[PDB]
Amino acid sequence: LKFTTEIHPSCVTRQKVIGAGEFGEVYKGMLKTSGKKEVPVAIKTLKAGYTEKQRVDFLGEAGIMGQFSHHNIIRLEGVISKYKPMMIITEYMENGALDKFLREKDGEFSVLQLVGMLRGIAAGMKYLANMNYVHRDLAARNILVNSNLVCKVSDFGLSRVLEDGKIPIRWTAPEAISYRKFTSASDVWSFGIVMWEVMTYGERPYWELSNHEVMKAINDGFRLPTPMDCPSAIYQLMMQCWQQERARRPKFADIVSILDKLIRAPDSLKTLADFDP
């Protein structure tokens, strides 16, 4: 907790319940920081009657989050560790999880807007990779969206094991599943899956094909198909992220550079509807 500001509980106001977390309920609320405008926050609490492992994992997640300082990584405001219930306090992301958000807004964004969301995610991952942090659990359900449409990588939980706190197979690179080689290049594979989630407005990768069939299909060369209206350069980028040989995948710095070029040449993101309504 040397990486975290300790907050007195009288500075926090819980206002409404917004979800259930691994360790307890999550609230939207307000935080008073050092006689100034109170700021909106998300408040994760540790359920009373926690075990000692749960307490360590809970506070350890805040310790990890406090080591990061990037526009596209969720900002930790501080922790309450000296009073009960213990809390992790972060910036508030009004639009919630990216996958759920896009499913509710199906077809309601421009392609340029969606690509800008992907660029922000890639910038956050570029920052993490540069700090030698391998996420291992990158998926749209772990990216939060604020009222300005900024996407931020947001779940840094410690109690994570691979599926079959679960890391699901459908987002995981083949070498990480088969040989437990989790690296920034396996996070790049996961980023390709996120790109597909964004471009489909939150469809489930591989639909309801089973886990065993997924790993069989993938190791046979199957890849998710192009979403409707998806720019060719964007789908080809997903395909590069899904190269079987990890050394052939782009780095996150490459992904950011490519997405920036597409944003600068926006005609590259246009579909038929943009030429014939």
Ligand SMILES: Cn1ncc2c(N)nc(-c3cccnc3)nc21
């Ligand atoms: C809506 N919002 N804004 C920030 C935030 C967060 N850090 N965590 C969560 C969250 C975390 C775990 C389960 N449900 C919600 N939601 C948040």
